[PDB]
């Protein structure tokens with residue numbers, strides 16, 4: 518689990534969104550595994566606006582923050598899971614590292630702010646859904 522709180526927005530994995538998130542929906546994309554909902558209180562996270570390929574992510578299944586190098590956001594085939602059939606997921610970045618399903622929502626951060634959240638894993642890889650292209654998260 519995990520979310521990003523920026524301005525009056527909440528960003529979560531689409532597969533973990535609550536009834537309140539869907540009732541207060543701003544934008545969602547199944548192919549990205551992302552959902553953004555509105556909030557009443559202001560958040561404190563800052564979204565990175567950059568092309569960094571190194572950062573640190575939180576892995577709940579190790580209680581550890583790991584420094585990683587990661588690939589640029591791309592269209593990647595993701596095997597079937599409890600929440601989606603086998604499909605291509607867009608805006609996905611991979612790194613060599615540990616990830617289990619309940620690690621989804623863990624933040625990946627660089628020197629500029631939040632880059633994305635854990636979304637995929639297995640086979641010694643970890644995948645992150647990028648949020649740096651969602652520029653509207655910085656306004657209104």
Ligand SMILES: NC(=O)[C@H]1CCC(=O)N(Cc2cccc3[nH]ccc23)C1
Pocket residue numbers: 532550595598599600601606616617618619620621636637638639
């Ligand atoms: N974005 C997706 O398609 C998600 C949907 C929910 C989900 O359980 N997975 C599998 C997964 C995620 C993270 C870590 C993992 N380790 C092994 C499997 C695995 C994929």
Ligand SMILES: [Zn+2]
Pocket residue numbers: 565566567568569627628629630
């Ligand atoms: Zn950066």
